[model samples]
Target: GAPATVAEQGEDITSKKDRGVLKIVKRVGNGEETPMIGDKVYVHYKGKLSNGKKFDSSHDRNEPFVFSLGKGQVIKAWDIGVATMKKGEICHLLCKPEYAYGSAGSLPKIPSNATLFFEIELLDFKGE
Candidate 1:
């Protein structure tokens, strides 16, 4: 069959309640090359709110989002979920508000307490 499409929901991988980081491994990555704390990672992602409204996307901009892993440079879900991924992996993350923007949310587009969904593809990563 064709590759499993991104699911609407996923299992929470984190042990905490509000700090949940739901995960669905769409496409597993290569080997076991996981990211390090200070590693610079490159990825493309399509983020949507709970209502299926698109919020942000790296593909839409034709550029991979780059940031230092586990550095608070991105949302908590990204740090935790992406760290579990290997190079070239594609995972869908269902992030609770606490793992995303929390109750405050990123205004102008995201609403308060909105749970977010993201189709994230790890393009590559460079070690520190």
Candidate 2:
């Protein structure tokens, strides 16, 4: 007899009707609080272009990235996605040009109108 095992099924977390953002959760966090606006969040992220080319990774530097939520400092997708994440959560966010670097993509790795994929881990967060 053959045995069955658990499959890794990711859930879609898109908040809007538009396909600007496609959020897939790999692992659920057990933390109590979700990040709030103006909160400083610590995370590790691996950024890749639509061509499947990696552009950046915080893990390579052996340090987590820190940013404030609901701010324009980062991409639009990140402001939306990271706001809903809990501590220790890991998710993959597929963002279109409108939500990412837009028509004037961030060079030298990311090109114009490029779609991007980011595997982001919410390590922790605190109010500013």
> Candidate 1, 114: how far from true, in Å?
0.9
| Per-model TM against the reference | 0.88, 0.87
Writing each residue's lDDT as its tens digit, candidate 1 over 1-128 gives 11112233566677574436778888989998799999999999998886688888988779999999999999998999989888889988877788889789889888888778888999999985
RMSD of each: 3.4, 5.7
Best by TM-score: 1
What is each predicted model's overall lDDT from 0 to 1? 0.82, 0.79
Compared with the true structure, the alpha-carbon lDDT of candidate 2 equals: 0.79
**Candidate 2: where is the Cα deviation over 4 Å?**
1-15
Off by over 4 Å in 1: 1-9, 17-19
